Every structure is written in structure tokens, then in C-alpha cells.
Design a protein around this nucleic acid. Structure first.
Ligand code: MG
Ligand code: MG
Ligand code: MG
Ligand code: MG
Lengths: 63, 136, 386, 225
RNA sequence: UGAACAGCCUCUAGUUGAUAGAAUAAUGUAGAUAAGGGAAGUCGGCAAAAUAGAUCCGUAACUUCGGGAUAAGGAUUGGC
RNA sequence: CAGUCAAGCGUUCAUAGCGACAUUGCUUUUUGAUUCUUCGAUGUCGGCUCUUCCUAUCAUACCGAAGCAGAAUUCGGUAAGCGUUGGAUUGUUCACCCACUAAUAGGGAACGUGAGCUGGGUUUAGACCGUCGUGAGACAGGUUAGUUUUACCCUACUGAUGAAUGUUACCGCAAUAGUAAUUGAACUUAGUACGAGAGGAACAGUUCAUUCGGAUAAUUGGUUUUUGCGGCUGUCUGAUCA
């Protein structure tokens, strides 16, 4: 199997878990759950959502 | 589908009933396709015949070029936008409903496809896979 | 006049009446056909439904489009402690059917099985099978005359067995007792096997093995009184309907001047005994073993229990059967697993199955992690961890 | 020979197969006649690999191949990649491409020396093609057809292009590729020539409905005699 | 608060009256939400949804020249 | 709706398929005829919903015949097990087109079914037009608006208890009753059999799908009084916190 990464939060996606979304510019996004999927559809920036890997990498928290 | 099927297809969750309008992905000059029928659909009282990705439908061009309007022609669904499950269990969906024009044997009226197509459609129709830019 | 448009009948007439089951343990109405050539073995087993999970396996179907490709499938887990053999019974065959003639019990009966013979256990002198054990502890006098009676008569031998409810996380303390048919050897060999196995435990791998198609017999989940729309699946009446719309409009013609039995009506939904056939065993797990949830490809030592335990059930410290798909009944319910009544080839019942990965994430939410070590490695250190 | 073959009824052989000088790739769900054509014509000198790319029977439109290298999309699994690594000779290099257009047979029309690509590919993918295939690259369209792999059939000796192609585009592409090009049809008039057939230095395989003048044009432009 | 004797909350004053208790089946009455499609339902878009204040831009055919007109159609709005 | 007869048709040849002139029937989904029952009232159109029955079988199963070479088709037998659709117009039944499908067969059950619905039509009282009439008014002529009541009783049906079989508990047997699965596509057989060619099968095998049914909730989606967490408006608790 392959363990994919969340396109919004960077969480690990196990097989059969979450959803996938193909945008009209032929780019693939993978969501581990409906929470990150709905934040993506609400167009929030993952650099400003405090629990994401990209936020913690930006803010040097636990790095 | 029916006649021009290259192999079989697993059941995809039906997302396009009769009366649905989808974008027309090819370069044949048509803008949208209006679904009036699904090939191979069964019979149940009050149930609308619905289409999924890779299905061949009967459609009319509601908006587009006048030599394409006001007649029925076969079409092939290439983008579904209703989420369906594969046998590897990913749930996936596009962001719009889209199809292309074809004859009853399945070869495309147009020549190029804009945007992605599904692999369940590209495996089933080789001309769509031939003119398709990206297959996901 | 005739019905204007044809449509199939709502519901199945062969599952009637849709009433509550007589007991919470469903009856095994038929056992596999005996042949007197195989060794003496049980035909079924008892377990408790624990819950469901997913696996990933590589499909082997030579001709499918998903041949030699990974698929993810839903399996359900049945917790099976080793069952305890107490008692055998023989059945002679009469022109009015099968009839039991004697029952010979084991000597020492445990408290969890003799709680089955009581409604108020806490106020009792516990006098059960005391004079029967007094019939024992002679040499043999009142014992092998009944055993030789079962040998001389009794064309069908069945074994009384009982679960070990105290090994499970259930709070019941009162074991389930059942009859399981023996399907090997002659009548004398059957009763000799039973006599040797009195007061002894039989494990689940002695009766089941991998890639075996089995049947699940259980009572379904109860739902109480239900309207006709969800109980039978009839069409909802339109919105501007006076006096309600979750109904059936015409419940019969003028003649015959009675409501027919075939008309769908409201009543009890669920809690019916069902037998679902052709479920493939993917794993016969051992409870005396770590890395139950590990495969040859995963190879991380984790048990089959998910994070936080099975929801509403608990732990799987005993042996278990991983079986493909859905079985009737909800969690914490007794379920009888039975061998197949026929030999199925089908190129699907003969498929050899080797698992790749078993899901052990939490079912009490959107679990991200399979093991607490993996969760700690991903999240780093926290405030509570110093 | 332009060999008449069908893929279970399909007269498009370039969709289901990829033929180079050094190797051949065929789909796993193929008929005995379809395998027997490549086995008889290619012989034992050239390996034929039954492969699946990204879970799809279509492999010719998914992959772009060369005698020096093979390009596969991102969606190709590790089992398929390892099977291709074992089955293929050590000379060829197999490298995954991470690019949005992701259907490399449609995107790329290539031979041993020179390649035509889709105009809008990424620069990293262009450099990856130039590295792995060792092939100089041009971004060009065939009379406005962006899918140069589907709308051109190319070999070392010559090339077949789209029938509705401007003549000026024909000498421009011929001078750019240093091979003679002919506008023609395959499979009783189907426009998609690269999807219609596969060709290499000594073999061309086409659909059964490809007519005799079309087959004569094929053998003339590819010099298979 | 707000344009406002609108709606919502409060002060003075006045009530705390309308048989109650326990459970939460079906079918109701009243209030709601729904993936994908969007009137295919129906005699008929019945019912519901959508729109909504204010500022700026822009506004057709026709006309009894007064209108149509908030036509249609766009953009903005907090706190400091 | 079905017989019988056989002048003819069918190249030739009554009867493969038909069949004139005659003549014997069956049916009660037509319309009449009659007036028996009901006028101290049996709710009179159509549709929606739902069950069952009939066979005079549209499809599916197995067969017989051909003016059956193959493919397609036609006639007939056992057969009612199983299915028989989505729409535009019209209040309609009916009809007529579009389209899918294996097929879109015909009917009954107080012209099934209004204390099941609806109320478009018809069929009150308002109103307009045309024709007729001096007029009041008339018109199976056209148009528009027009209150659809009651079950808590008995039976039936669906589910639920329960006295009495010395008491109580556990494990069972099985009389009787019900019953369920259905249809298609693709690959291959095979461009094979057959045929002069055009054309072009079938059995076995494999992978899927349609309709139906019984469960189930690992995953995905829906639902939110977990009023669980966060945010936001207005007001009130002097502010802050809450
Ligand atoms: Mg209807
Ligand atoms: Mg009727
Ligand atoms: Mg009927
Ligand atoms: Mg859960």
C-alpha cells in the first residue's frame, strides 16, 4: 500500500480513508477528512490554521 | 454504454439523471450537453435513468452552434463531480460534469479534450483516451 | 380494473412474520450433512460480534481488471474464546421426526454455565446438578448404561457446549449453552470423543481454518415499532396528502372484503433471526499472541484491537475470526458460526487470501494513527509528557 | 509488414501497445491473436512485456518510450515499476514523471534522435526527457493539434502526420525533425494516426480496417521493405 | 440598536395564570437540514428556496413624455 | 376472440404462410337492450399509491413447423415462475410523438381503490362571449372563480402480552403455513460453422452489469440539543473574567 499526505494539513492518509478531489486545472488534492476538505472549500490558508504541519513549519513550533 | 464498450465497467455511483446539463469538453463548438437518455439503463417505476462516468448517453446541444442544436446525438461522460468509490477505496470527484460528443460506435466528433478525464472512461473508450490530455 | 403500471412487490414474503425472535441466540435449523469417513469434528461454533474494520489485500482474479492489484475490504471481527464441552445428547429418528432420548452431562459444571439455569442467582442455594454429580463418583453404574444406550440407538449425536463469557469484556457473567452436531466417524466414535472431551475446551482453529466459506446465524439489531415506509420500503405519498404521508394508500380492494396478508403494514422492525451464507474467513487469530494485527508485509507488532478499543465492546484478548463483509446482529451479540452446507467452487470460494495491512485506527472518530508509538512520533512531545 | 491486429475488437493498436526498437509493451488483457502478432513478428530477440500502467489497460497513451529510456506517469504503482525494471533490459532507464498532463503517450511524440512535445509542458519535464531519453526536444503543434503523440506516428526512417495538416507545417516539421513526413490516414480514415498504429525500424502494427493504400503509405514512409 | 410608536433586549409597573408526573414507538401538527442532479414531480413551480438594508456605478423595448425604473446588471459594507 | 369447409393466393403447389362464398361457437375489459335491487342517499372522471388474480404470452426457459443455408423473421405447443419503463402535449381514459430496453402484452377485483390522497374535469349558486328567444332564460358550445366532514366500536390485517396443562428452569423436535431471485452486456469460441458473395451464429469458459430481496455501518456522504469547541450581532449583569 501507499500512505499519502494531506494536501491541506499534511496528515498521513491510510488506504480507504478520506477523499480525493481533482480540480479543473488538473491538480489532485487529497483530504484526510471532511474537516480539512471543508476548510479547503472555504478557501482558508493553511499557513494561518494553527494545527497544520505547514503552520508549525512556518512558526518553528516543534522543529 | 452498450455496443462500443471495450470491456466491462464496475458500478460507479450514478450522478447525472435525465435532464442534467453538463459542460461539453471537446472542441466541436458545442457548449453544453443536455442528457435525455442513458444507454443500457434499466426499467423501474418513477425512477429516472441516471448516468455515471464512462457512460454513453443521448444528448442534445442546448447552447452552442446552430448546426449542432435541435438534434439528438450520442455523448460520453468524462467528468462526474459526484463522488464515487473505486476498488482501491479512494472516494474521488471532479468539480464539474463534462462529456464529449460521439457517434454510436464511440469515436469522437471533436479532436481534443480540455481538462481531466477519468480512467474508468479512458479504459472503456479508446478514442476518448486518444484525444484526452490528462487521464486521472 | 388492472394496475396501470407494473412494478415489483415491495418486500420478501418468505421472511414472514416480521416478529421478534423467540430468543437472543438464533437457532441452527440445519447442520452440514454427515459422512462417516472424516474424523470427529464439530459443525459450528459460538462467538460474540465485536465490530468491523478494513483490510488491504492483493486481489487474485485471473481475468478481472483489478487482477494482481490492491483492494480495501470491510471485515467484521468475532471474538471466540475456547468453548467448553459439557454434555452430549443423542437423537433417535421416528416417523414423527428426530427425538432426543437421553442427555449425559459432564461432572464438574462451572458457575458461568450453571448460571444459565437460574433467573435469581444471588439468592439461591446453588443446588443444580448436585444429585447428578452424586450419580457420578461411583465406578460407572448410572453412566455408561446411558452412554451405551446412545451407542445402541441415537442415529444423531449432538454435543452440549457453552461459551466462556468471563473471558470477554461483556458484563453478563452467564454463559450461552448450545447443541453442536458432530460430523465424523461412527456413533460410538462420536460419543467416545464427547466422553473424552467432557470438562475440556475446544479452540476455534480446531473447527475453522483460513479461506473457508462459512455461515453466520444471529438475531438482527432491533428497532421497535416502525412505519410501513421504512419497514417495507414503500413509496412516500406526495406532500399535499391529508392525514399523513408515510403510509400505503390502498390497503386492498373492495373484494375480498378483508385486508390481505400480503399488504405491507406497520409493526416490529428488526430483532429477527437470520442466516447469512457464504462469508469467507480471512484470519483465524490467536489470542495468546502479540502482532495479531500484523501481516507479513506490515510486520509491526500490534494487536487486532483498535486505538481506544472497539467502540461499545472493548478488547480482543481471546482468539477471533476475521470474516469478510457484514454479518447479521450488532456488537456484543452471541452469533453462531456454521460450516457450509455445500461445497462451493465458484472461482471465488477457492481464492487463497493473504492480507497486506489491517486497520487499527480509532473507530471513535476520524483516527489518524494506527499505534500510539506512531501518534507520538508524528506529534512530537506534548505538555502532559515530560 | 504493417500487421493487421485488433485488441479484442479495437483497431487502435497504439493505444494498447508501445513499440520501440529495443522492447515492446502490451496490455495484460489481450487476446491470443494480439499477443501472437508481436510474438511472431518481433521474435525472441526483442522482449515483449505484458504491463499495466496506473491500473489502466491503455499503456501507449500513458507512456512515452525510447530505446534508451522509458517514461511513466506518477500514478504508476511500485509493483508495476518493479515488474518493468525486472522485465526490461538493463540498458533502458525507467523514471517516473511528476507533471500535470500525465498522459505521456499523448503528450510526447518521440523517436531515437529528436522529439516533439506538447507546448505547455513544464521545464523540469523537458529537461527530464532530454536527460533520460537523451533526445533533443521541440515544443510544436501539428497544424494546431497539441496532442502530437496522438496525431503523429514517428520513427527513424520517416513519419506519418495528421491528414488535415498545412503543407507549410509539413516542410517546417520535416526540416525540424530531419525526416520525411507524409499526411495520411489509418484504420479506414481515422484521424488519430499515433493512436492508430505503432511502428519501429522494421515493424509496423495497425488495425484490421486499415486499407491497402493506407498500408502502402505506411510501408513507403517507414521504409519497412 | 436602528430611518422608525418595525423586530430584538432592558428600566418603572404588573404577572409567573393555561391539570400534572414518567418515558421518547409508529402515524401526525409545527419548525428545520440535506451529497449529485435541478421541475425530470404536478392540471399547474402548489409548497419551499433564492433576492432583500444602505452607498457608488449602470439601466432596454415601449410610451398618453408624466413613466417604465429598485428595470435588467455589477461593486462595497467590521474593528481600530 | 376462436373454429369448421376449401374456390383461390402462394413461380410450380388448396392448407409454409394465407384464404373468398358459407357456417358453428366462445367472451363479458365494447356498446346496446331490459328495469330486478337501491330515491328516510351504496360518495358518480381521471391520476397517484398498493396488493392479488386471469391468460386470449410482449419478453425470459425448453421445444415443434417453415416458401428455416447463416443472420434476421414468421406460425404453433407446455407455460402466468418472473418482468413489462423515462418523457413533451391534453383534466382526460384513449391517442400521438421522443427515447431507453429483453420487452415496453391484454385484462379483472362494486367500470378495485375519495372516513387513502388530489380536485385538473364534470356537476350548484358569481361572471364573460357566440348562437337561440320579445322576454324571463336555454345551450354533452367555449371561458374564468368556486368549504372534499367523523373511527376511540366489531371484524379483518400488522405487530405485542397472557390464565389453565404439579411448580420452575434449560436444551430441543417439527405438524402446518409462507418462500425468491431476475435479466442483460463484453471477451473468447470466431470473422469460425453456413454461404456464390454480401454477410455471419451457437454450446462450454471468464469478467461485469440491470431489476429485486436480506442485512450491516470499517470507509465516504447526510443529519446535530453532544447546545462539544470556536467565532459573530443586538441588549443586560458598572468594566474585566464569566
Ligand atoms: Mg410516475
Ligand atoms: Mg386501477
Ligand atoms: Mg397489467
Ligand atoms: Mg465510528
Amino acid at each position: 500500500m501507499k500512505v499519502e499526505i494531506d494536501s491541506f494539513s499534511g496528515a498521513k492518509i491510510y488506504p480507504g480513508r478520506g477523499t480525493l478531489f481533482v480540480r479543473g486545472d488538473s491538480k489532485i488534492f487529497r483530504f484526510q477528512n471532511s474537516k480539512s476538505a471543508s476548510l479547503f472549500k472555504q478557501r482558508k490558508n493553511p499557513r494561518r490554521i494553527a494545527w497544520t504541519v505547514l503552520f508549525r513549519k512556518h512558526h518553528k513550533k516543534g522543529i | 454504454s452498450g455496443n462500443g464498450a471495450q470491456g466491462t465497467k464496475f458500478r460507479i455511483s450514478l450522478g447525472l439523471p435525465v435532464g442534467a446539463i453538463m459542460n461539453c469538453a471537446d472542441n466541436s463548438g458545442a457548449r453544453n450537453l443536455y442528457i435525455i437518455a442513458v444507454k443500457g439503463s434499466g426499467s423501474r417505476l418513477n425512477r429516472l435513468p441516471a448516468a455515471s462516468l464512462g457512460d454513453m448517453v443521448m444528448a442534445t446541444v442546448k447552447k452552442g452552434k446552430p448546426e449542432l442544436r435541435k438534434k439528438v446525438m450520442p455523448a460520453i461522460v468524462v467528468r462526474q463531480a459526484k463522488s464515487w468509490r473505486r476498488r482501491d477505496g479512494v472516494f474521488l470527484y471532479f468539480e464539474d460534469n463534462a462529456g464529449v460528443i460521439a457517434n454510436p460506435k464511440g469515436e469522437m466528433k471533436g479532436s481534443a479534450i480540455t481538462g481531466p478525464v477519468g480512467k474508468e472512461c479512458a479504459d472503456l473508450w479508446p478514442r476518448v483516451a486518444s484525444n484526452s490530455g490528462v487521464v486521472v | 380494473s388492472h394496475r396501470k403500471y407494473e412494478a415489483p412487490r415491495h418486500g420478501h414474503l418468505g421472511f414472514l412474520p416480521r416478529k421478534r425472535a423467540a430468543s437472543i441466540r438464533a437457532r441452527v435449523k440445519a447442520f452440514p450433512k454427515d459422512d462417516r469417513s472424516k474424523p470427529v469434528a464439530l459443525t459450528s461454533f459460538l462467538g460474540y460480534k465485536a465490530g468491523m474494520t478494513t483490510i488491504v489485500r492483493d486481489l487474485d482474479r485471473p481475468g478481472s481488471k483489478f487482477h494482481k492489484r490492491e483492494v480495501v475490504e470491510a471485515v467484521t471481527v468475532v471474538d471466540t474464546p475456547p468453548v467448553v464441552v459439557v454434555g452430549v445428547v443423542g437423537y433417535v429418528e421416528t416417523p414423527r421426526g428426530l427425538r432426543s432420548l437421553t442427555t449425559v452431562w459432564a461432572e464438574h459444571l462451572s458457575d458461568e454455565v450453571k448460571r444459565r439455569f437460574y433467573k435469581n442467582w444471588y439468592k439461591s442455594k446453588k443446588k443444580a446438578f448436585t444429585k447428578y454429580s452424586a450419580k457420578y463418583a461411583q465406578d460407572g453404574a448410572g453412566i455408561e448404561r446411558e452412554l451405551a444406550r446412545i451407542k445402541k440407538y441415537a442415529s444423531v449425536v449432538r454435543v452440549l457446549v457453552h461459551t466462556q463469557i468471563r473471558k470477554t469484556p461483556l458484563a453478563q457473567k452467564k454463559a450461552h449453552l448450545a447443541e453442536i452436531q458432530l460430523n465424523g466417524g461412527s456413533i460410538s466414535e462420536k460419543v467416545d470423543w464427547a466422553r473424552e472431551h467432557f470438562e475440556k475446551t475446544v479452540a476455534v482453529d480446531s473447527v475453522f481454518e483460513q479461506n473457508e466459506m462459512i455461515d453466520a446465524i444471529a438475531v438482527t439489531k432491533g428497532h421497535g415499532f416502525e412505519g410501513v415506509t421504512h419497514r417495507w420500503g414503500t413509496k412516500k405519498l406526495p406532500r399535499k396528502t391529508h392525514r399523513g404521508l408515510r403510509k400505503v394508500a390502498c390497503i386492498g380492494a373492495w373484494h375480498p372484503a378483508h385486508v390481505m396478508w400480503s399488504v405491507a403494514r406497520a409493526g416490529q422492525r428488526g430483532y429477527h433471526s437470520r442466516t447469512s451464507i457464504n462469508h469467507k474467513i480471512y484470519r483465524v487469530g490467536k489470542g495468546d499472541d502479540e502482532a495479531n494485527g500484523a501481516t507479513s508485509f506490515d510486520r509491526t507488532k500490534k494487536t487486532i484491537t483498535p486505538m481506544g478499543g472497539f467502540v461499545h465492546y472493548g478488547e480482543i484478548k481471546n482468539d477471533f475470526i476475521m470474516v469478510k463483509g457484514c454479518i447479521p446482529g450488532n456488537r456484543k451479540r452471541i452469533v453462531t458460526l456454521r460450516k457450509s452446507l455445500y461445497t462451493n467452487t465458484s472461482r471465488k470460494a477457492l481464492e487463497e487470501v493473504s492480507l497486506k495491512w489491517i486497520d487499527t485506527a480509532s473507530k471513535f472518530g476520524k483516527g489518524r494513527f494506527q499505534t500510539p508509538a506512531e501518534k507520538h512520533a508524528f506529534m512530537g512531545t506534548l505538555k502532559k509528557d515530560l | 509488414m504493417a500487421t493487421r491486429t485488433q485488441f479484442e475488437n479495437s483497431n487502435e493498436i497504439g493505444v494498447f501497445s508501445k513499440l520501440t526498437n529495443t522492447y515492446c509493451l502490451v496490455a495484460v488483457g489481450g487476446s491470443e491473436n494480439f499477443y501472437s502478432a508481436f510474438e511472431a513478428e518481433l521474435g525472441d530477440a526483442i522482449p515483449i512485456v505484458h504491463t499495466t500502467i496506473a491500473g489502466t489497460r491503455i499503456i501507449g497513451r500513458m507512456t512515452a518510450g525510447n530505446r534508451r529510456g522509458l517514461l511513466v506517469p506518477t500514478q504508476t504503482t511500485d509493483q508495476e515499476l518493479q515488474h518493468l525494471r525486472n522485465s526490461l533490459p538493463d540498458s533502458v532507464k525507467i523514471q517516473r514523471v511528476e507533471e500535470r498532463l500525465s498522459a505521456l503517450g499523448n503528450v510526447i511524440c518521440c523517436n531515437d534522435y529528436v522529439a516533439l512535445v506538447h507546448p505547455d509542458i513544464d521545464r523540469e519535464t523537458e529537461e527530464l526527457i532530454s536527460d533520460v531519453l537523451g533526445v533533443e526536444v521541440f515544443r510544436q503543434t501539428i497544424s494546431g493539434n497539441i496532442l502530437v503523440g496522438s496525431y503523429c506516428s514517428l520513427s527513424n526512417q520517416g513519419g506519418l502526420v495528421h491528414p488535415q495538416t498545412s503543407v507549410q507545417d509539413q516542410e517546417e516539421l520535416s526540416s525540424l525533425l530531419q525526416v520525411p513526413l507524409v499526411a495520411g490516414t489509418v484504420n479506414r480514415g481515422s484521424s488519430v494516426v499515433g493512436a492508430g498504429m505503432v511502428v519501429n525500424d522494421y515493424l509496423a502494427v495497425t488495425g484490421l480496417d486499415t486499407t491497402a493504400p493506407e498500408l502502402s503509405v505506411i510501408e513507403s514512409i517507414f521504409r519497412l521493405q
